[PDB]
Design a protein around this ligand. Structure first.
Ligand SMILES: CCCCCCCCCCCCCCCCCC(=O)OC[C@H](COP(=O)([O-])OCC(O)COP(=O)([O-])OC[C@@H](COC(=O)CCCCCCCCCCCCCCCCC)OC(=O)CCCCCCCCCCCCCCCCC)OC(=O)CCCCCCCCCCCCCCCCC
Ligand SMILES: CCCCCCCCCCCCCCCCCC(=O)OC[C@H](COP(=O)([O-])OCC(O)COP(=O)([O-])OC[C@@H](COC(=O)CCCCCCCCCCCCCCCCC)OC(=O)CCCCCCCCCCCCCCCCC)OC(=O)CCCCCCCCCCCCCCCCC
Ligand code: BCL
Ligand code: BCL
Ligand code: BCL
Ligand code: BCL
Ligand SMILES: CC[C@H]1c2cc3[nH]c4c(c3C)C(=O)[C@H](C(=O)OC)c4c3nc(cc4[nH]c(cc(n2)[C@@H]1C)c(C(C)=O)c4C)[C@@H](C)[C@@H]3CCC(=O)OC/C=C(\C)CCC[C@H](C)CCC[C@H](C)CCCC(C)C
Ligand SMILES: COC1=C(OC)C(=O)C(C/C=C(\C)CC/C=C(\C)CC/C=C(\C)CC/C=C(\C)CC/C=C(\C)CC/C=C(\C)CC/C=C(\C)CCC=C(C)C)=C(C)C1=O
Ligand SMILES: CCCCCC/C=C\CCCCCCCCCC(=O)O[C@H](COC(=O)CCCCCCCCCCCCCCC)COP(=O)(O)OC[C@@H](O)CO
Ligand SMILES: [Ca+2]
Ligand SMILES: [Ca+2]
Lengths: 50, 65, 277, 43, 42, 43, 259, 44, 38, 40, 49, 44, 43, 44, 42, 42, 44, 37
């Protein structure tokens, strides 16, 4: 799968892409947890179990 | 106080009289308006103020929760 | 941080309160003494809003949906006294925090413009919006007689408050100060559109053309409507219209209830009962 | 202690203190008028 | 010293102030006596 | 002198670190999802 | 062709989502336009990195935009490079975000409120190529409006109400008829200095000009012109900045605080 | 016709064309969704 | 400030403070007589 | 637009071929759609 | 087109990457949300298992 | 412990301290007035 | 752990820390006053 | 894995991390207090 | 050329781009065949 | 060296900071013991 | 030139050591707190 | 100077102690009025 893919860091600077991906992953994790907490089936706090 | 006349060495009297007159007039207007609002001290209603009595099961205001 | 031409302007002094105690910058912001006070007023207000959302109106209607979060004022039976925390005192504490934060913001602006050596038009203009808020939550409740006349703190609930207050007078369009304020708002929007359009048109001419001069700006509007107001006067007029709209809106809301308790159309009867007709 | 006026402007201190006292008195009267047990503007 | 009032002008003005205020307060206290006679507020 | 200023022996090192630092994160994610499937399967 | 796409979605929801996408694009465009003056930023992050990391934030900058000036005055790029300068001050404390102290004599320091850049050294021109701001001694077709004071011969008083000179001529604007400057003949050096209208108050009752920025003894250091009939964009900025510095440096009580 | 590119900018034309085609495809898919006889995300 | 004129201001400040407090205490005593609150 | 005549040759040559490949894909998709559920 | 790579001679290759990444992410989110909106493909409230 | 009053101005500190104490006192008095069992005005 | 003050400057850090501590204390007291089981002002 | 500090400035990273952690802790406590199952002030 | 890229760099950029698109359009096919096995839509 | 403080000044500041913080934590521990003795929350 | 941030290798290793020690202490406290919370009442 | 940084403590601490004493007196009287804990 393209061994010379390491050249991609000569086009876009690593630092800004690292900042972007960290922010994006944090946002996605919070969103997925909130979506799960917003449903009757998967709400692990109000399920009553155990 | 003994030497209060020095207070006029720091504040200009010409502005002080204007400010004092304006403040006193504003205070008098505010106090008169406050009395006019109060239900006990309202001389505009007249010395012979006689509110309407309710003869039967009547109420001036509708009920509310 | 700093713009490439900003370091020449970061000088010491010009503070109102504090001196050298809080005279520093935090990132791009200047804080000062009023910066500290305003930031922490805002922080406590935000935290109390979040706690009020956590408690909810009940244990069943509590929700974290942002459109549905609402913190409500006390009942009209408490008068102007202090309500219990769960029954409407949180609203009063948050109102006090909001007033403190707004005043701190205005004073910090005064300090900044003292430092830069410029006029005081901006905090002066902000004071009008602050006064409109104060009429909404302080002057009208005191004149009416209870804190319950203030509006609730919520994104969608204060719209319900506006609607019900409007229909308490059966037709709110017939309020005259309301008409004046609306005329000012619409005129301000028109004037802003024209100012932006003209500046952009002069600065970005047709292709293969040079930047236009000051004579073109005046000629354009003299050839459209027969009069041109000028470069400084358009900013004068914009400020005047934007402040008159808010002043007349404050007048319109402070006379509804305290000074008029009937329908708004009926107010016009003085015109219809003249002996001329 | 009495040298406090060496580290404070006497005029500004008086000007600020008078406004502070006026506002405090106004607030206390407002609170007293809002309690039906201590409101004196009836009867 | 700041406002340029000679130590005689200030001492002259203070007497007029402290007499006019006396007359004003006499008028006010008379008005309050009459008002309390009309309808006491305590 | 590319449009990032990173030398030929520096992008290689960054990529070598990046691949491993992403593979371990994906392994942790895989383990978490394997544990979550045994709790309350969704398909 | 109906109003319900699915059991939950409808048209009025897709329309609002499309508006949100367009609004995000518009905000990015506007923030990119905002960054044509003063970027990349000057911070500690750049200088610690040895001029390697450039602080621009998000979004980054746009490609340069060209303005062409009339009468063959030249061409200017909206995003450009400018030479870093050495300020005339010294930090009060070594921690970041600390203020600077205006080293030297604050009025004659070029730092703080008394600061200005270096604009182009040519006069602004009219639509026919004439200088734009000129004294009334060459704009003879101008006149003072009727029933108005005509402030020639009025005495100018300083901050402390002490006379510092008299008005000698009025500088007006050919393209837009209004007053931009007053000329004061200082009776301490036998010189003439300019005074912006924004720093002068007309006492039309007793015929006076009030200058609350600088004192009477400070009218002896105002920057002078090159030629007595026209002014350039550089000199106008210098003259205005000198008066603006007096709003902080005039007296010992103007630095603050109140308490 | 290979002189049309002397008037229109090739880069600008390609960018505008891609955006226009994407929006048109989105609109047609949504219109097909709104019709109950062509909604493929419901039953049959 | 100069010792010759630094507490001369304090000398009348104290007397004004005491005069202000005397009438305040009298007013509070009368108010307690009218309607006690504790 | 600052383009030579020969520069405006291969661009058109590539453009037409790309457009016709896209059109072929569109035609295949539409034939399959008609095989699914006709609209006439 | 066998000479299509010259498209990289006119469009800068360091912007198409960002554009396609953002576009694919947003498109994927939109399609997942549209599927969640339906009552047939909603995997979180389908009742299975 | 005292090595503060050299560049930390006592004169500027006293104003902030007095403002802080005044605000705190007002807050505590109003919180006490919000409770029926400690409101010393309305009760009795 | 004594070189942290070569990364953070005392003058701003202490102000921020004291402000946050005060706001946190107020928040905890307000939360307790809103819970009837722990309200200490009910007699 | 110690050369990450040659890409990011420690001071800004530290302030951002501390802010995020403080906000996260407050958020989780508020989420727990909004449910009667885990509210420890009235449920425990 | 215009974007400061030579011909020899453009050729290998195109090659790497094609090789990345191949994998991206290969994984999606597996995802979509699994989805069809799960719940057909047509 | 971004805070304008050397090693010695940093250490001298840190000693007083840690001593003050320990004295502040002791009072908190005592207050929480008393509050637990008042009305346990677990 | 120097590193992208201006830190040398040793100056970025001392920071890494102190950072990881602080993080380990934080994680140990968190683990103990979570164990106690599970012993209080489980959530799964 | 040296005559404020190290001497002005002697009055500041005394004033703080004198304020705390009055606070304690007020709190004792308030508790004798109506205990809360
Ligand atoms: C899915 C999501 C969808 C969205 C996906 C994308 C999201 C991301 C988007 C990112 C970009 C955001 C925008 C930023 C771009 C930008 O600002 O460009 C800078 C650019 C800078 O220009 P400049 O540097 O000043 O250029 C100076 C040059 O010398 C000269 O410049 P130039 O001439 O080269 O400029 C080209 C110029 C075209 O120039 C010419 O063609 C030659 C001169 C004009 C001739 C044509 C006359 C105008 C046509 C109208 C005729 C009116 C007839 C009578 C009235 C009929 C009324 C119905 O462009 C136009 O003017 C377009 C015509 C607009 C006229 C009508 C606009 C108002 C009517 C709206 C109708 C109803 C809309 C409902 C929706 O600004 C513009 O180009 C402005 C263009 C016009 C603005 C409005 C355009 C429509 C906007 C609609 C907004 C609402 C859409 C809602 C969508 C979502 C809800 C469904
Ligand atoms: C229908 C519309 C509805 C709208 C809803 C939303 C409306 C509310 C939006 C709220 C936005 C809040 C913005 C906060 C700005 C903070 C300052 C800042 O850095 O700006 C970031 C950004 C520019 O950043 P930059 O200058 O490129 O960054 C410089 C370097 O990155 C410098 O690099 P660096 O290393 O310094 O980077 C760190 C960065 C940190 O950046 C961030 O925190 C993220 C900011 C964005 C989120 O900057 C800072 O250091 C900030 C430090 C803050 C310290 C705070 C604690 C002490 C403050 C005390 C203050 C006194 C009290 O400014 C904006 O994004 C403003 C966007 C405005 C959008 C408004 C859209 C709606 C407007 C209404 C429509 C009207 C019609 C339009 C046609
Ligand atoms: C509805 C039926 C199934 C389901 C059916 C499908 C189908 C069909 C597909 C997905 C695809 C995806 N699904 Mg799914 N999916 C379901 C439920 C979920 C849930 C959930 C909360 O239940 C989550 C979090 C996801 C998440 C995902 C993503 C992993 C992926 C879309 C991301 C994307 O478009 O990147 C695009 C954005 C980019 C920036 C990619 C760019 C790639 C570059 C070159 C590489 C750099 C790294 C890059 C940033 C991330 C690479 C990840 C890979 C592309 C996988 N699905 C349900 C259970 N899902 C898609 C997929 O598999 O993509 C491969 C797909 O075709
Ligand atoms: C059925 C309801 C009635 C009606 C009942 C009412 C009622 C009730 C009111 C109005 C008010 C208004 N109505 Mg009406 N009104 C009706 C129909 C209309 C129509 C129309 C097209 O029909 C129009 C154009 C208007 C227009 C108006 C304006 C004149 C006015 C609102 C502006 C304002 O007050 O600014 C005021 C601006 C502010 C208060 C802003 C304050 C912000 C300050 C600075 C605080 C800072 C903000 C924030 C905290 C900062 C941080 C935020 C982020 C963290 C950054 N109404 C209908 C007929 N209308 C209001 C009014 O006049 O108020 C004075 C009002 O109360
Ligand atoms: C309603 C009946 C069918 C259906 C009937 C049709 C018909 C008929 C067509 C499509 C077409 C498309 N359908 Mg379909 N489609 C259905 C439901 C879907 C669903 C879904 C959520 O269920 C999705 C995600 C899609 C997605 C798609 C896209 C692959 C394609 C639109 C391309 C485009 O907009 O070019 C805009 C993008 C550009 C112009 C990019 C710019 C230039 C690029 C670089 C060159 C290539 C263009 C484009 C990317 C070509 C993609 C073709 C690939 C082989 C996938 N369809 C249902 C099941 N669909 C169209 C198509 O086949 O297009 C080729 C088409 O004619
Ligand atoms: C079920 C609900 C339980 C409960 C179960 C838990 C569980 C489980 C946990 C907590 C944790 C916390 N709980 Mg709890 N908690 C409850 C009720 C409370 C009450 C109360 C009024 O009743 C209070 C005041 C708290 C307070 C706290 C915080 C001390 C802590 C969140 C730390 C943080 O935000 O750091 C954010 C701020 C920073 C990260 C920066 C500040 C740290 C310094 C400056 C950086 C250097 C790090 C240093 C070297 C090592 C760490 C020191 C830290 C100060 C710990 N809990 C109830 C009884 N609580 C968490 C914890 O233990 O954290 C240690 C945790 O795992
Ligand atoms: C008076 C003419 C117009 C005007 C002028 C104006 N506004 C201004 C200014 C000026 C001149 C500023 O200088 C100032 C500024 O900084 O602008 C960038 C500002 C400003 N006008 C703002 C908003 C604003 N102005 C409005 C209106 C107007 N402002 C008028 C139309 C409105 C309307 C109509 O709704 C809003 C929302 C801010 C962006 C800013 C002032 C920022 C400020 O004061 O910050 C300090 C406070 C905080 C950061 C947090 C406060 C904490 C509180 C607890 C928040 C909640 C309080 C609220 C009562 C509860 C929730 C209400 C619900 C309805 C949600
Ligand atoms: C570049 O600067 C500009 C000018 O100077 C050259 C202009 O002349 C102009 C044109 C402006 C005008 C011709 C005058 C604008 C007048 C307007 C909008 C009407 C507002 C005035 C009123 C009296 C209406 C208000 C009345 C009631 C509310 C009742 C613009 C827009 C401009 O931007
Ligand atoms: C989310 C935050 C992400 C990082 C933000 C950031 O990194 O901003 C930092 C702010 O840190 C700081 O205030 C740290 C101190 C925090 C003070 C907070 C003040 C709160 C009350 C006002 C850096 O700013 P400064 O040190 O002022 O400038 C550095 C130089 O450019 C000089 O200007
Ligand atoms: Ca559970
Ligand atoms: Ca399922």
């Amino acid at each position: 799968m393209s061994p010379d893919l390491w050249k991609i860091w000569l086009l876009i600077d690593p630092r800004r892409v690292l900042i972007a991906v960290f922010a994006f992953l944090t946002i996605l994790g919070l969103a997925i947890h909130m979506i799960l907490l917003s449903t009757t089936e998967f709400n692990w706090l109000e399920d009553g179990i155990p | 106080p003994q030497q209060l006349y020095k207070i006029w060495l720091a504040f200009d009297p010409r502005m002080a009289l204007i400010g004092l007159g304006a403040f006193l007039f504003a205070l008098a207007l505010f106090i008169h308006y406050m009395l006019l609002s109060s239900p006990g001290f309202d001389w505009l209603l007249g010395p012979d103020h006689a509110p309407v009595a309710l003869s039967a099961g009547m109420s001036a205001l509708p009920a509310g929760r | 941080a700093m713009l490439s031409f900003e370091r020449k302007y970061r000088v010491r002094g010009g503070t109102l309160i504090g001196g050298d105690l809080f005279d520093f910058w935090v990132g791009p912001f200047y804080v000062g003494f009023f910066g500290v006070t305003g930031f922490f007023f805002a922080l406590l207000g935000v935290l109390l809003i979040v706690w009020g959302a956590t408690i909810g109106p009940n244990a069943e209607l509590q929700t974290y949906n942002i459109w549905q979060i609402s913190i409500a004022p006390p009942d009209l039976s408490y008068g102007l006294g202090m309500a219990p925390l769960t029954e409407g005192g949180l609203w009063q504490i948050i109102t006090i925090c909001a007033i403190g934060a707004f005043v701190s913001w205005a004073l910090r602006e005064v300090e900044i413009c003292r430092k830069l050596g410029i006029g005081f038009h901006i905090p002066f203009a902000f004071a009008f919006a602050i006064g409109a808020y104060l009429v909404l939550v302080v002057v009208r409740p005191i004149l009416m007689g209870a804190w319950g006349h203030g509006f609730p703190y919520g994104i969608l609930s204060h719209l319900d408050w506006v609607s019900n207050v409007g229909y308490q007078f059966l037709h709110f369009h017939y309020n005259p100060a309301h008409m004046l304020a609306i005329t000012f708002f619409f005129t301000n929007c028109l004037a802003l559109s024209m100012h932006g359009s003209l500046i952009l048109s002069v600065t970005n001419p047709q292709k293969g053309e040079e930047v236009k001069t000051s004579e073109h700006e005046n000629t354009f509007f003299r050839d459209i409507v027969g009069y041109s107001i000028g470069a400084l006067a358009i900013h004068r007029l914009g400020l005047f219209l934007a402040l008159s709209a808010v002043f007349w809106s404050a007048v319109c809301i402070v006379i509804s209830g305290p000074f008029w308790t009937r329908g708004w159309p009926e107010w016009w009867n003085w015109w219809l009962e003249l002996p001329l007709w | 202690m009495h040298k406090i006026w060496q580290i404070f402007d006497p005029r500004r201190t008086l000007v600020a203190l008078f406004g502070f006292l006026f506002v405090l008195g106004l607030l206390i009267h407002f609170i007293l008028l809002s309690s039906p047990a201590f409101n004196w503007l009836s009867g | 010293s700041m406002t340029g009032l000679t130590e005689q002008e200030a001492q002259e003005f203070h007497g007029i102030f402290v007499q006019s205020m006396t007359a004003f307060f006499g008028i006010v206290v008379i008005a309050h006596i009459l008002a309390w006679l009309w309808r006491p507020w305590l | 002198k590319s449009m990032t200023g990173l030398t030929e022996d520096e992008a290689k090192e960054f990529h070598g670190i990046f691949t491993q630092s992403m593979t371990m994160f994906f392994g942790i994610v895989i383990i978490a999802h394997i544990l979550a499937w045994l709790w309350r399967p969704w398909l | 062709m109906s109003a319900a796409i699915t059991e939950y979605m409808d048209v009025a929801q897709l329309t609002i989502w499309a508006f949100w996408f367009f609004f995000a694009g518009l905000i990015i465009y506007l923030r990119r336009e905002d960054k044509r003056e003063g970027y990349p930023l000057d911070s500690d992050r750049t200088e610690r990195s040895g001029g390697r990391v450039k602080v621009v934030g998000f979004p980054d900058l746009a490609d340069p935009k060209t303005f062409v000036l009339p009468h063959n005055a030249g061409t200017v790029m909206a995003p450009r490079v400018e030479a870093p300068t050495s300020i005339n001050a010294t930090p009060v404390a070594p921690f970041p975000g600390a203020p600077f102290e205006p080293n030297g004599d604050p009025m004659l320091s070029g730092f703080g409120p008394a600061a200005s850049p270096d604009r182009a050294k040519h006069c602004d021109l009219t639509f026919e190529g004439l200088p734009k701001i000129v004294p009334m001694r060459v704009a003879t077709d101008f006149s003072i409006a009727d029933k108005d004071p005509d402030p020639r011969g009025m005495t100018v008083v300083g901050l402390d109400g002490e006379v510092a000179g008299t008005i000698s001529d009025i500088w007006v604007d050919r393209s837009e008829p209004q007053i931009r400057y007053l000329e004061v003949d200082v009776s301490a050096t036998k010189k003439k200095v300019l005074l912006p209208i924004g720093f002068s108050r007309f006492d039309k009752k007793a015929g006076k000009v009030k200058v609350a920025a600088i004192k009477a003894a400070h009218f002896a250091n105002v920057p002078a012109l090159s030629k007595p009939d026209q002014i350039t964009l550089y000199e106008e900025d210098k003259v205005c900045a000198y008066y603006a510095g007096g709003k902080l440096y005039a007296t010992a009580e103007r630095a603050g605080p109140l308490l």
